Subunit: 548 residues, 2 copies
């Protein structure tokens, strides 16, 4: 069945949230009977996609509904286990595509903790009591600090290689090196043994930040939480903004939201996303923005778009091309952007910018081809122009015989750094290789309605076919997209979009994930006699011992 | 088994011509000269054997031709420059064969750029006919690309639409990182078979100049001379002949003058024992030049490169390499001192370059690497790189016997003379460029560091006592043989490359790992996949679903 990423705390099976002044406590309490797919139990706080769907929502709730909260303590509500990682039985029963989506989404949820540490005024403290293994340690890694109980029952481990024949692929290796700076040969030992590291050795090797005896642990966690809270600028007095349930109509051929249509052509294998500008001028003043809350256009659009991206990634694997279109009045988009820029220091506007940033950042790493079609009547302006700059190709409709009807691309300040991709660059900076001449040229033209011929001349679009050439040029490009191997297209896209600089996050989606994917498609890990499927059976996994 | 040793008298596929400062390297591939059976190499398409000759030819230019300053790469076939890796050969190759072929060919091309930076050479691709796929990937690694403007000859990367694979020999990474082709233009370029010709190829940044056929040869020679003026190579020096590499092929390994490889097939371990100069190597430049190919640092570099290539290619099930050393550290340090003192001399610089490129093959090899530092060893200077390249390094503590206890001795060469493909020294990578631990080891240059200090400084993984050594090392090796090789290679690709990325790490990382995933799936390699339908007049059958 299809996955629905919509949930709320009243529905959580796996997490408890509680609030005590500036400290939120997020308790891991996974329901063993609560698997999102069938055929497995989730024992010992092991997890699946459904657990992460709830985790993603819980962080969203803290971000938007709890402005007065400054630190989040992540802790287990189970005896003897913090988190035992991605459920091995679940992995063994999953298709290749399901695993790859599961890795990608869980990676984005974790990247999101760090995103909020940078940009939301939040800090995350992992309070680790009991076994913290594999994905358990990968989650702790994404926190700002990790405190470990100093007793025999408490350890950190990454048993994936020796136990499962796979990597710590939820960013584990990349955080061990890039974030913790664990010396690589020590990391090798850590990643090639099942028995966990404890106490002062874990701290000495840089795997955790502090270790505390059991009788002092709770007090130490709370005191550190308050120290981390002092780093924040979040308000001492503010009511939160409830994230109301997203209204969505599911159709055989797509999805309907207030701010977004998705229409699927199953024969052509194309999903067309039509993003819709604010229907009326959005509020300029902070009091009206806050009062609008989840009905404030930039937040509403971010939420609906994120839901659509996640739904289509997960539930529509054969529909390999996404087309981006827009409709509405560019003046209302530009007014929205002006309010984002003016009020960007305000906690709520800042949080909303954060969700837009994270949501758009899902696009560049999605395994779908991306074409933006800038047709007459569209409104690729400001935030919406990011849909052009994210795309593999952008075509814009020239009308030599009817120039007054030509569409325009209109840049705003948001296109110059407000929504970095995971390379940390704006999409335009990536587009022009950070070259100052073409970037200066378009910066000079912020706010101008750039028409098709000029947009092509400035390099803002791939081509601007006229009304005679348009139909065939776009149809043929889309036919070719459907006819080529999806494997080759996704690989090509992963290299062309990430056209130079690397960061911890590009390494997570690149070097780490691509190696994991190759491992995931081979019998040593996933075969009937492989490491995942023999787990718990008392038998020896059979490996092809040859190197590649 | 593959033998990587060859020489110009044996070439089937290349012609070298020497005209003063300009060497012409002519592509003239023998259709019947495939290294494996079952395919012809038509229209200057290539296989591993073609690249083995190319690698040798560049080596000959480097060492035997101090007078050469520019290398013109061109085709001796009409109509075609190079049509890329042979598609029939790809369809007939195992997964492991393809992955090794991509890796070796990538290193050959990275080596052109390595010499452009460090040898005083420049490479000019004179593209005088169709230049497709691997053909364009080779041109990309040159310093400049000149395309004949003849209304026909084109550059193309048809791999995606035609083969269902990527331009995996650095093609995509050079298109973005080196040529700076706007990514959406690159997308068009990489998803059309016919490619691009004439002025548009220049405008899109795919080539540097286009010249009409009646002026082409003149323009190529003129530009070659201009690129030659940049060099400091000495026009009046004699070359150093690269004589044969003596090697005994045994059932259980390889014997070279400066290196033993011994294979334990049951344990799946190959032990490389590198040997120091047997006596003090020459300090003077004249004596170094007179020794030539027999000069220890060059001899060792060549033998070690041959062994790495041989073991990578011919011994797939032997997943762990153990590095040991033997001989006298004083002689190693004397060799290093000569390298540092004379590094501006063309021949010494060239030898440093081969050591650099050879060591740089280690970090990207799909084998686990353990360095064992035991009594009698000499992990000193250049040889200490074998410890710093390793996934783990164990050093034998002998608290009750100091004479027998080994030492690590650093020299200047450990601080940047031999960068891995991240551009870092192995020690800089090891310590995440942290100044405290690096200062602590640099200040001990030239000193014999004993096992306890070595472990405290973080230069080794562990220094086990002699009653703990046998079991600790044996268990680590048993575990290495028992774990999945797929997971180990992936692990090693992430832990060795522990932060910074470069164009070369992107070639071996982002680009190659995606290629490898594609290579292991039926859309590309299935009986009715893209490679195998080629030329058949049928349509590939694809699973259409994205991952």
């Amino acid at each position: 069945a299809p996955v629905d990423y919509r949930t709320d705390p009243s529905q959580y099976k796996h997490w408890k949230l509680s609030f005590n002044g500036p400290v939120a406590t997020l308790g891991i309490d996974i329901a063993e009977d609560g698997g999102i797919r069938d055929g497995y139990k989730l024992k010992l706080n092991s997890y699946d996609l459904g657990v992460d769907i709830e985790l993603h929502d819980a962080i969203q709730r803290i971000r938007f509904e709890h402005p007065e909260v400054r630190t989040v303590v992540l802790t287990s509500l189970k005896d003897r286990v913090f988190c035992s990682g991605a459920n091995i039985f679940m992995l063994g029963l999953s298709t290749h595509a399901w695993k790859v989506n599961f890795c990608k989404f869980t990676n984005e949820t974790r990247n999101g903790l760090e995103d909020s540490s940078r940009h939301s005024g939040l800090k995350f403290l992992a309070a680790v009591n009991g076994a913290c293994a594999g994905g358990g340690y990968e989650l702790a890694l994404a926190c700002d600090e990790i405190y470990l109980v100093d007793d025999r029952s408490s350890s950190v481990s990454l048993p994936e290689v020796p136990l499962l024949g796979v990597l710590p692929g939820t960013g584990g290796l990349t955080r061990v090196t890039d974030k913790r700076k664990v010396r690589h040969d020590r990391a090798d030992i850590f990643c090639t043994v099942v028995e966990g590291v404890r106490g002062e050795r874990a701290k000495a090797w840089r795997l955790v930040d502090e270790v505390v005896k059991p009788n002092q642990f709770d007090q130490a966690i709370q005191a550190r939480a308050l120290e981390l809270a002092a780093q924040s600028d979040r308000p001492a007095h503010a009511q939160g903004v409830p994230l109301t349930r997203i209204e969505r109509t599911d159709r055989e051929d797509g999805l309907t939201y207030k701010t977004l249509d998705v229409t699927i052509d199953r024969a052509k294998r194309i999903a067309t996303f039509t993003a819709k500008a604010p229907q009326t001028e959005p509020p300029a003043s902070i009091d009206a923005i806050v009062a609008a809350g989840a009905n404030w256009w930039p937040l509403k659009f971010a939420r609906e778009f994120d839901d659509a991206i996640l739904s289509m990634r997960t539930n529509e694997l054969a529909v390999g091309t996404w087309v981006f279109r827009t409709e509405g009045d560019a003046r209302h988009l530009l007014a929205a952007d002006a309010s984002l820029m003016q009020h960007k220091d305000h906690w709520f506007v800042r949080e909303t910018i954060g969700l837009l940033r994270r949501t758009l950042a899902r696009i560049d790493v999605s395994s779908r081809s991306l074409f933006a079609l800038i047709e007459p009547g569209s409104c690729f302006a400001g935030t919406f122009a990011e849909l052009a700059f994210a795309a593999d190709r952008t075509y814009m409709a020239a009308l030599p015989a009817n120039e007054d009807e030509e569409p325009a691309i209109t840049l705003s300040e948001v296109n110059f750094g407000l929504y970095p991709m995971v390379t940390h660059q704006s999409r335009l900076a990536r587009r022009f290789y950070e070259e100052t001449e073409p970037l200066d040229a378009v910066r000079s033209r912020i706010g101008q309605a750039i028409k098709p011929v000029e947009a092509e001349r400035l390099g803002l679009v791939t081509a601007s076919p006229d009304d005679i050439d348009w139909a065939d040029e776009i149809r043929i490009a889309l036919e070719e997209r459907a006819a080529m191997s999806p494997d080759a297209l996704t690989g090509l896209e992963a290299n062309l979009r990430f056209n130079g600089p690397e960061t911890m996050e590009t390494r997570i989606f690149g070097r780490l994930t691509a190696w994991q994917n190759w491992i995931f498609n081979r019998p040593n890990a996933v075969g009937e006699k492989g490491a995942l499927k023999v787990y718990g059976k008392g038998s020896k996994a059979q490996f092809d011992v040859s190197r590649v």
